[PDB]
Design a binder for this molecule. Structure first.
Ligand SMILES: Nc1ncnc2c1ncn2[C@@H]1O[C@H](COP(=O)(O)OP(=O)(O)NP(=O)(O)O)[C@@H](O)[C@H]1O
Ligand SMILES: Nc1ncnc2c1ncn2[C@@H]1O[C@H](COP(=O)(O)OP(=O)(O)NP(=O)(O)O)[C@@H](O)[C@H]1O
Ligand SMILES: Nc1ncnc2c1ncn2[C@@H]1O[C@H](COP(=O)(O)OP(=O)(O)NP(=O)(O)O)[C@@H](O)[C@H]1O
Ligand SMILES: Nc1ncnc2c1ncn2[C@@H]1O[C@H](COP(=O)(O)OP(=O)(O)NP(=O)(O)O)[C@@H](O)[C@H]1O
Ligand SMILES: Nc1ncnc2c1ncn2[C@@H]1O[C@H](COP(=O)(O)OP(=O)(O)NP(=O)(O)O)[C@@H](O)[C@H]1O
Ligand SMILES: Nc1ncnc2c1ncn2[C@@H]1O[C@H](COP(=O)(O)OP(=O)(O)NP(=O)(O)O)[C@@H](O)[C@H]1O
Ligand SMILES: [Mg+2]
Ligand SMILES: [Mg+2]
Lengths: 310, 310, 310, 310, 310, 310
């Protein structure tokens, strides 16, 4: 527990738990100011527990085989499409933010729904059991921050039915928050940590859409928009890392051919970026154009009554 | 009333009512700047009542069966065509924007007129009584923003007569605003909230046409056009959501085969999108090509002296 | 006068009159940029007089019986054919653009000439005296923009003689502008407002032909053609509305059986559309295939030495 | 001269003369792009001289008696047949295109030859001396674009002899260009303006045949054919108007009873259209079936060693 | 040679010669597409050499005495009948297509044979030596496209013997191609240009019969027949013009009294048309019913063991 | 050893080694306060050993050929791109900080990985053996401070394989420290000196990214940000100098076209600065826009499965 930390006694631990610092990584990655803002915690005590948490979490230089072990803590979520899983190097990655931008109706929201369904199929989580334990991915839950009102429980049921999963179980293990503007959107994202503290193993976070709120609220003001968006994406990236979570976001496009909106801050902050377009009928094509370790490539798949397939 | 909100006393409530914030949802979805622009309301007070309104409206994370309850607040309006109602998954949806684009004379304006008539037939509103009360849909009124001058009261009378409804009652419960340009069009849409505040249960909003004004006003300038159009569609989407209203818009087409005009912003902002074309004689075919939860499909119907039928 | 408007004093009124804004409707339907382009008029002043003009002209939401009153301001011009007047729902409508397309020699130009003659017969203007005053239709004048050189004063004289009207009076009350290309055609149409300002009660505007200039000037470039054509038709529609004028246009046809030329922009912009074809001898058949409120139908008539008859 | 025009100085005038714009009407009817394609002429300067030329040529709205004056600038050429001149309302009209279609051997080419002969008989040009001056029709010359090789100087001599005219004078005042295909045909027509610039008072232009080249070159491709034909007929119509010239064209026929070939574009572009058929022996019958101001009618005449007679 | 042409160097000349363009007139009358279809020749280069060839061949406007010089390049072939030569205005004309239609056994094929024999008698070619040189008509050769199998060398020998000519010389200077269907017939005609390129001075081309193949191959399909026939006759007319050749064709007749078969396209394309019928015994009567410059007239002649005589 | 220094005996040397001052240069460049902060070391003793270390290290005025010898101690690391090595004047320079800024996905992180691989290929270190000994660059190790989580051992393996190097050897000789915020980032950089003291020949230091942590932590506070950033870059520059190390940093960009973020302090502190942008496909372009001795220039290269190439 928190009292394992230097300078931290039962009293200080109570103050930390109340201020939301319940595990070591959050303390190890905190700033002294951040902790001193907690009544009762001094600069000296704050600096001492941060150093102790870094030490207990072994956050130092690593080399050799240890570098491979860190990469092995990443687990991946299947998309239900073999070509898409392949272009992704296996599946959607935990500890990163993956963005699907695309023209209207291309399937961005369908992919988000399919992901909430797939999270409830144990065989769709791919991981190295020696680096990620069965308990770490047990009873996974998803958080869907819907900023457009397009969450559709009947779609969840249909995709689950076709996947052989129970639809009600997916709805029971998915938290949906409807955000009507960028302030709500950002706050819900900041509150995911509270869901985790309440015992929910959040392993998938969806922000659909990442930018439609900001784009119609900040139309001159393009700096304050970029600033707020940057804070939001830092929160997303940090939660993906600290909670070994897959974070997926959708994005719209504008002319100039098309470019995902959101400018440089969204461009730098999204770890993986895709452009999704429609093919003939129910065919879709997802083009990976940014990733840390894979070549750009395209995946053809379909969206049908069953969800994503092929 | 508004004084149920934290920090809000009779004085502040008067200022809110005067500034147009009369119900909790509008306050819960406001920005601090938006409220502080009201003389007498501070940043602190503004932030406090927004949080209180969100709390009173229970705008947090939901899961399980509660996800189904939200979807059940959606009611649908019949189109008078059984095939069209079926392709729509039941009828035109409240809380969303539905767009009918199509070549000249295909029936876009006829569908808008039929919808104003159908709103006055209680049996044509389909809803789950446990989620939507009889009082919520009682004395419904329509708003028709006519940007081309094609509203025709004699057509309203004819369609009503054939539906067994009283024509004068439809005209009495339909507000029509003739907009000669995009500025008027946008302002009328922004003023619908005032009609509601005056006691009119606005449940159907029609924008016919959504784009003919913008397309001939902005011919280079294609960015300022897209910006204004985006603000207008955000206003439409928000009013559909906050007032549990069906919002219908018509759109024109251009070569490239045909594509509805308005580009990406109209494409992303319209929840449902149809392409209407003429068949032989009075036959028409409506092709649904964008929707959140339904497969693309086509509906055949007819437009006759009776209105839409089949 | 213009000083009735908020913010407008004698000085500003002079600037408005000089820039061509002489009546309230034109100001009520102007854009702030449009007015600020007048040296001396600020954005603030511009926005204030537009709002004041809208208010003085009562351009807001209307419902009930008021919806019927707006429709009653429409007056109709007889075509001299009882079957054609019937298919038209009474006659050619003011505040709309009516297009007659047809194969060569079918009578498009004859109908335009007959209309200029009929305008000078008081009994051929059909209107509701409680909505349209005798003074509003008094001393009516026609404008004929001839883009092919087919205006024929001797035909005017012959048709007038057979109608019992004085031929010279028709020529005296008809302004003809010969346009040799689309630029001239468009400019003449834009200058009709100046004729009105000079005291001419323009109540009929004829564009014969609407498209023959554009079709041979833009032969690739089919986008710039559609753009120019759209601006021209917006000017026509707006003048029909603001000046309670009947606007008639003729159009040619091409193979594919036949289709009027001009594509989607002419198709959407023409309120009423007819296809005229020749029958045996002097018999003609006009097929109405687009209108806001009438079923498609055909009218048989004849073109003789007397003009249009039957 | 050209420097009378606003913005045009000696330098610009030289550039205009070199680019072929030598008189005001051609400039008044030019497009800004058309003039800016002249090295040295800017968009601003181009727009300014076009407006100035329109102003100097008084190309605005006209009404009353002025409408009669425009029609009086039309002069007519006798056909040598009293019945044909009568069906034509006086003779072949300047400022228009007149088409004679007919079965083989019906006399199309004979009429073209007779017209070149008649142009050289002063009494065969009918005009209102107060609208058309003796100098305007003095030293008239004809241009005969022969696309079949049927021009026959011996026929010219024979018809001239029988008319009391000198045959050599007709040949001296007739330019013949043999076109072997539609490209040559169109280019010769475009070059008539150069003949005029060289001091030739071209008052009659004959295209015999208008369509035999296009019909065997474009046999699928029926759109490109119609496009080229349309450009050619626009050139013909514009030269008839700008140079107060009679333009005559011949056309072939096909089964379906017979119809002149060339489709809708030739049908709309020819101002007057005749069908010529053979009667018994040297008798011929010309049926007028399209004209702006005359009833359809038939003229009987004969073709003999003397040319057209009766 | 071809390098005299602008843009044409030795390389391009080789490509032209290989593609069959060996003399200037063929290039002057080519289309840009036609030349660009030659690998190595660009649109720009093609347009430039066509203009250069037209210029080198002086294909512009001509007037006065020059019009007589063009007509003087026409030479005529005697028919052996003085009355027939007289009705023809001298003899069969080069640069034109002359058709002899007639009932069975009337002598159509005999006239074709006599013409091949007469071509080998220098005194039977009538020409103006100042316009046509002795070298132009030297070593003339004939091409006989026999579509019925009726070419008879023994008839050639007999007619030659009676004319005082050597029979073998006529056979040596006559190329006969037996066509079993319209495709072969048309191709042989298209290949005459190759014979000329090989050094044969082709001055007479006979198509016997022009229509018997088409009439039994296309029996509904009367449009495709007319199209193919038109292409074939354009090829014939162009070769008559470019190679200053006499082209003769025979045609059959049907009831309706009789009419030559082939419809309007053969009727327009044949420059001269005759109807041949039998008189008593070996007497024949040829009625000229279409020609550019001669009155209709009849010639009586006989067909005997000597060939055509009288 | 340290006792070679004036005033320093075994006891004082122990205190120095414990406080991290193990070699003369660090002492020669220390402040008296810095050393007196070591219990047991007086101001007098501190001043005396600093002067002695400066003397033993010969840190005085130099001129003539000695100026060239100092510059010769700089060694350079190949980038694997010949154009990039050329724009760099040979390769990445030791004793300096080189910054690669660029839009998302441009290859900043790929260049950092390639550099860690290239360090393990002896032939990729370019140096003057008379100024830099084989032992000075022997067993080189890299330190990669990853502030975004984008270090990818599989990429190291792939690039090493394609370079002919052993992948495991690169991972064994590369220390990676994951920093979640600017405090960790700065501390890891300060701790590199300890790695060196432990016997690791650190010759490459990578900070990827230099600014993404600071930019989202300090959003007003732009002074404290600039101060912390300045201290961090001084630490980087000093370690590059004292340990003859190549220091590479990556940077993000913002609109204003683009500018690397970090303001004036990063701009002054980075010795070399590049802007990297994407070309077509895998092509990249690196623009050098700041350096001490080279002209601005651009290098084109590619990023493929092999790493950086061209
Ligand atoms: N139940 C279903 N059966 C078959 N196809 C479906 C179903 N539901 C949705 N679709 C398909 O999914 C498309 C809509 O996909 P969606 O993921 O919502 O697009 P989107 O990219 O998020 N568009 P938006 O947010 O406006 O930009 C539809 O138009 C249908 O083609
Ligand atoms: N009273 C009626 N009786 C029968 N059919 C009618 C009636 N009124 C309208 N229609 C039909 O409706 C068509 C016009 O439909 P409309 O809805 O106005 O087309 P639209 O798509 O809105 N065209 P537009 O806005 O120009 O693009 C007519 O041309 C008639 O076919
Ligand atoms: N004075 C007249 N007396 C009787 N009929 C007339 C008279 N004038 C014109 N017509 C008829 O009107 C026809 C021409 O009608 P018109 O209106 O000019 O056709 P149009 O459709 O405009 N053709 P165009 O513009 O080429 O496509 C003639 O060919 C005559 O049949
Ligand atoms: N010198 C003449 N004397 C008497 N009649 C003549 C003379 N020249 C020509 N004709 C008549 O004119 C007819 C030919 O007329 P022509 O004008 O060439 O017909 P066309 O319609 O142009 N035929 P085409 O172009 O094939 O379709 C002849 O067949 C003679 O009937
Ligand atoms: N050697 C000959 N001596 C005398 N008369 C001959 C001789 N050869 C042919 N004829 C005459 O020529 C007639 C046949 O002429 P011919 O030119 O073949 O007719 P055609 O019009 O071409 N018939 P066809 O092609 O069936 O329609 C015979 O029937 C004989 O009258
Ligand atoms: N294994 C690989 N094979 C081929 N190309 C690759 C591979 N790995 C990465 N890439 C390319 O490298 C790009 C990513 O380069 P990267 O160096 O991470 O960009 P970056 O500038 O650091 N972006 P960021 O930090 O967000 O601003 C990819 O999107 C691929 O184009
Ligand atoms: Mg209108
Ligand atoms: Mg010829």
């Amino acid at each position: 527990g928190l009292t394992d930390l230097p300078g931290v006694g039962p009293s200080t631990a109570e103050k930390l738990v109340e201020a939301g610092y319940i595990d070591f990584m959050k303390i190890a990655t905190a700033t002294v100011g951040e902790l001193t803002d907690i009544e009762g915690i001094s600069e000296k005590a704050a600096a001492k527990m941060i150093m102790g948490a870094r030490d207990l979490c072994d956050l130092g230089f690593k080399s050799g085989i240890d570098l491979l072990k860190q990469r092995s803590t990443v687990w991946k979520l299947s998309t239900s499409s073999s070509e898409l899983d392949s272009v992704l190097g296996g599946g959607l990655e935990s500890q990163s933010v993956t963005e699907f931008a695309g023209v209207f109706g291309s399937g961005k929201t369908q992919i988000m729904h399919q992901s909430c369904v797939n999270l409830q199929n144990p065989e769709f989580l791919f991981y190295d059991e020696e680096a990620v334990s069965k308990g770490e991915v047990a009873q996974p839950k998803a958080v869907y921050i819907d900023t457009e009102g397009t969450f559709r429980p009947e779609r969840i049921m249909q995709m689950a039915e076709h996947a052989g999963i129970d639809g009600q179980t997916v709805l029971d293990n998915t938290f949906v928050a409807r955000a009507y503007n960028s302030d709500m959107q950002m706050l819900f994202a900041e509150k995911i940590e509270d869901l985790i503290q309440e015992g929910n193993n959040i392993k998938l976070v969806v922000i659909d859409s990442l930018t439609s709120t900001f784009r119609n609220e900040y139309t001159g003001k393009l700096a304050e928009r970029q600033q707020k968006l940057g804070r939001h994406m830092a929160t997303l990236n940090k939660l993906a890392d600290l909670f070994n979570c897959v974070v997926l976001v959708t994005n719209q496009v504008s002319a100039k051919a098309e470019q995902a909106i959101g400018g440089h801050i969204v461009g730098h902050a999204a770890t993986f970026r895709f452009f999704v377009r429609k093919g003939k009928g129910d065919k879709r094509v997802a083009k990976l154009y940014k990733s840390p370790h894979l070549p750009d490539a395209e995946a053809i798949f379909r969206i049908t009554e069953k969800g994503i397939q092929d």
